[PDB]
Amino acid sequence: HCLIVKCTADILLLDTLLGTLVKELQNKYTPGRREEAIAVTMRFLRSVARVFVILSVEMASSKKKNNFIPQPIGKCKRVFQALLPYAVEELCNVAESLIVPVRMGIARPTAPFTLASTSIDAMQGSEELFSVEPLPPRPSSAAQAPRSMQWAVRNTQNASSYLTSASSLARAYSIVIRQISDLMGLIPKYNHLVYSQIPAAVKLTYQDAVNLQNYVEEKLIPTWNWMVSIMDSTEAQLRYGSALASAGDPGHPNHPLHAQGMMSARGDFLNYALSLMRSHNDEHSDVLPVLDVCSLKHVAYV
Amino acid sequence: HCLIVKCTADILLLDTLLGTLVKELQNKYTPGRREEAIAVTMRFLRSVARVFVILSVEMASSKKKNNFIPQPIGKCKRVFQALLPYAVEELCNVAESLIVPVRMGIARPTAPFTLASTSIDAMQGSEELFSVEPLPPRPSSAAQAPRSMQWAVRNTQNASSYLTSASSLARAYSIVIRQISDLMGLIPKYNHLVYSQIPAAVKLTYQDAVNLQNYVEEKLIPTWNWMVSIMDSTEAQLRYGSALASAGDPGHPNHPLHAQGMMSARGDFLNYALSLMRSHNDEHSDVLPVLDVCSLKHVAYVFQALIYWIKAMNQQTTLETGQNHPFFRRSDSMTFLGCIPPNPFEVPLAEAIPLADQPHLLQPNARKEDLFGRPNCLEVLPTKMSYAANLKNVMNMQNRQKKESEGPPLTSFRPQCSFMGMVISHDMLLGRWRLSLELFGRVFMEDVGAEPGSILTELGGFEVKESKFRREMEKLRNQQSRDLSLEVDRDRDLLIQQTMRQLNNHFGRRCATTPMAVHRVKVTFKDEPGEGSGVARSFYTAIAQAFLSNEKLPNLECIQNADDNAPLFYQPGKRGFYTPRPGKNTEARLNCFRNIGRILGLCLLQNELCPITLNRHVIKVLLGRKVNWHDFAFFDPVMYESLRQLILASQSSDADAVFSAMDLAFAIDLCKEEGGGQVELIPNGVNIPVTPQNVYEYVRKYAEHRMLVVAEQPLHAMRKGLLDVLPKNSLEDLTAEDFRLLVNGCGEVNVQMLISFTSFNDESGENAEKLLQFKRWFWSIVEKMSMTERQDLVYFWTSSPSLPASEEGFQPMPSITIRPPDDQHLPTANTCISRLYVPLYSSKQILKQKLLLAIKTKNFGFV
């Protein structure tokens, strides 16, 4: 953290560190040293990755497209560009670890927070998170939808919440997927975009690009299946509700274009449970599917 | 719907329908008709299943176990019992469809709702849901956790919500899993439970039961994997946090026992994300894992239901001088969940039972693990914290296991659970997820514990048993309109004789074979005939003091008209704690003891404390259940340990020489309080030497004789005395530790406990700050009181010294009235309402002096 975020007037230090790692990774003529260097490198890269994610999540994306891209994050990109084949693998694992609590439905509730606009107020939050000692041992002693789709929305026709935290983890996941794609994007030009840009970086070859791509695809299959299955199910429910809106009579008070506490709530819940049970066997021919899309913000990000 | 819920005065209609389906399902001789009938039947059954689930979800489970089981739901069960093999399959599919929206994390938010108590208001909601026309075509035009686990809870150390709907779907899922298990439960008896019960039902055979079971297992594997992986991950995080709490320094502000908006929230979220990323690669060695369990209510419901299934299967599966002899085996409370004993002959007494080592260590809400000493898919512990690796390992382990009826009639069906593991018995799983279970067993008890026979109640501590205790004792109290009245002196000799004589005249003029259930117990003193509760509390105290005194008794033969003067009780062994002294064993003595047993029954019936501190083996005998070597530690810890050392010496290379040098024989000295002299443990025992090979018998007979043979008649008398007042069933809930909390309450006056039950009233008219300073003064004085002075304070304030072990222990609650400022007057307490009244003293010194002088003026008048 401190080398990257707090040397706010230098870069040669970081370059020296990377040059050292690269030289030792190429120390093929010394026995064991190769594998030792790989193990060392990976253990460093996961630390870089944590620093990178924390920063990226805090800094608000500029809605005017600007190259502000503050130097902490630029430095992170430089590391990953210099150590590309390894950086890709560790990034897959960070991505994977961020999504699973949401993809299994487990995650904690939290209150919401504003993304930080200034570089300074973004950076400060990470200081208080990395300025830490291990515990000592015991002392010696949303624009609104059109009418053809409004029926499918929970609408009127701080405290913590589960959905806040589910959403923000999906937001965070997207960043890593973009960054992995970007690094895969550099590969064709790399025999130029190493030597014309950076003092030292890892040599790599077509065979390696193949194996990286194999690895990257595998790590995405679970989240892909989860996304696809939910999307298909949602699109089906929407299109059916539209076809019924065409064939049915808008004079009826239950038509999608036309449309107490505890018992109304138990009504809502029972309508939902009954719609769920019906839908499983296509026993649902003449009433709108019970649905709300506002929960699905995490699949939208993914 | 309408045939089942609205024909509220008929059943033959439904029977006719079922008979028709069954006949056509057996129409094998007509082509195609068979398959047509099956298709028809299934389409009907799914409709029945919807009706059933809707009803079952609405009707609130009766917390008193009742067979109300309203006839709509009974009819549903009849259908499924008549169409069993098909009913099972469709039920799997309904279960599956209910869980997936939660198991994928997708489900809608909703507001909460109350379960319906009456049958009527349950039924009405379903009417408005089934009274529907299809849309026409267009016209032609939570008890709080202990400190070792509090760090893992989001706690303080209508709108819709997602969690409401996630939870209620899990609640609904459990019902179907129970019902499937129940139907599988009927299969062995079915060739009787068809024809003896219902006009018509489907014939089925052993071969079919096999295939049903195959089908049912498969449909559960996904939810099983999801449950298991999350549980392992949770248990790992809990156990690691505990190990760190042991090794770390509690002086540090980040220790689990020691422990802005947007930025604090972004703090919380970042702490969580960082803990998540760290945990995946075991890069998490020196900070607590970020966790909250309150979200996990849906896995709690699913877990409870999945045990139900395996537990039912297991019921189908089950249908010396050795150290292995039952005397030496660990007993009630001691045998932990799926555990094997820390052997008492290898482990020090001090270590084997920290409660038997230190008797004052018992608390109402202590963890059972402390008191009795801390204890392939299941053998390897939940080591990894990451969710994902546990899931992957679960699937790999599952892959390891992957890698007319001829012969048996249904009555011979031998099912089990065998997949996921080779054999599961629920004790193993209660061994594996021990902490998660215990934590659920505090946090979710009000809700998941309301399921019928919910496994959480088996983790129910003292207060669960006490919740039953009030209900049973008040039920036994309110069934009778006849009081007990005792008029006694304060003098020890007169007090004993008068109490026992009046108890015999009350007992004997009522039927002596029926328990002495009474409306109220009333007591009046001679020359002070004030009456009722506080007087009776002062009496239970004083009569106990009279029995425990080292002074000589008056002749107990005086009690027969309704010398064996040895003191009634003595302290065996190197405890402060009592067993009856046998005296001359005359009938008059046993008659007295039989009345003392009645006093225990009476105090408990009234929910009043009796300060008689009896030893564990005495209490086990009173409960009517077996006494073990471990209870000899409760008889005499120093002798138990010395005999353990004698057994360690029997395992030494010089044991024959050491036992020769000790000169021990099968004869024991008894103290005067045990009847005195030297007694043979076996005939001719003085001439039979103890050897390293007979020592196990010697140590057994030594312990058995001292705990039981010495006092068998006093014990027989007291136990008869307890049964003379209370019915046997009331003993069945309790071990001696529980009986201690109910009989004696908390003997240790925990000042924080007393604070939480105390209310303050003000009559002084002085300002809230002076009142709060005076309240602080009072509690800081009570904190500085010795335990004796605290016990005297509660005795002065209430006419009893022990605190009740709970809120439920108080009748009525303790309270303090602050009176106008006066430094002359003393504090005074109406013990018949357990309320103290205190002047607003000008200084803490005067408050202390006046309070201590009052409670130490032990001659209390019975207000």
Author numbering:
A (entry chain A): 1385 to 1525, 1707 to 1722, 1773 to 1874, 1908 to 1950
B (entry chain B): 1385 to 1525, 1707 to 1722, 1773 to 1874, 1908 to 1967, 2015 to 2070, 2093 to 2120, 2160 to 2318, 2499 to 2799
Mind quoting what the paper says about this structure?
Here, we used genetic screens to identify the HECT-family protein ubiquitin protein ligase E3 component n-recognin 5 (UBR5) as the E3 ubiquitin ligase that governs agonist-induced degradation of numerous NRs and characterized these interactions biochemically and structurally. We next structurally interrogated functional domains in the context of full-length UBR5, which is expressed predominantly as a 310 kDa polypeptide product in humans. The N-terminal region of UBR5 arranges into a seven-bladed β-propeller, which shows weak homology to a regulator of chromosome condensation 1 (RCC1)-like domain (RLD). Following the RLD, a large helical region forms the core scaffold of UBR5.
To unambiguously assign this weaker density, we expressed and purified a mutant version of UBR5 lacking residues 522–720 (UBR5Δtandem), which in SEC-MALS was consistent with a dimer (648 kDa). In cryo-EM analysis the dimeric UBR5Δtandem is held together solely by the rigid interface in the central helical bundle (bottom, S4A, and S4B). Reduced orientation bias of the dimeric UBR5 particles allowed us to generate an improved map at ~3.4 Å resolution. One dimerization interface is maintained through a large central helical bundle (residues 1,350–2,110), which is among the highest resolution regions of the EM map. The insertion following the 2nd blade is largely unobserved in our EM reconstructions and is predicted to be unstructured, except for the 50 amino acid region that folds into a classical UBA domain. The other insertion between the 5th and 6th blades forms the aforementioned dimerization interface (residues 522–720). The eponymous UBR domain, a small motif containing three zinc ions, protrudes from this central region and is also clearly observed in the cryo-EM density map. As in other HECT-family ubiquitin ligases, the catalytic HECT domain of UBR5 is found at its extreme C-terminus. We observe an additional density from an upstream region (residues 2,022–2,067) wedged into a hydrophobic surface on the HECT N-lobe, promoting a predominant L-shaped conformation of the HECT domains. This region, which we refer to as the “wedge”, is poised to influence conformational dynamics of the HECT domain over a catalytic cycle and also scores as one of the top hits in our tiling screen (residue 2,050). The EM density maps have been deposited at the Electron Microscopy Data Bank database with accession code EMD-17539 (UBR5 dimer), EMD-17540 (UBR5 tetramer), and EMD-17542 (negative stain map of UBR5 dimer with RARA/RXRA).
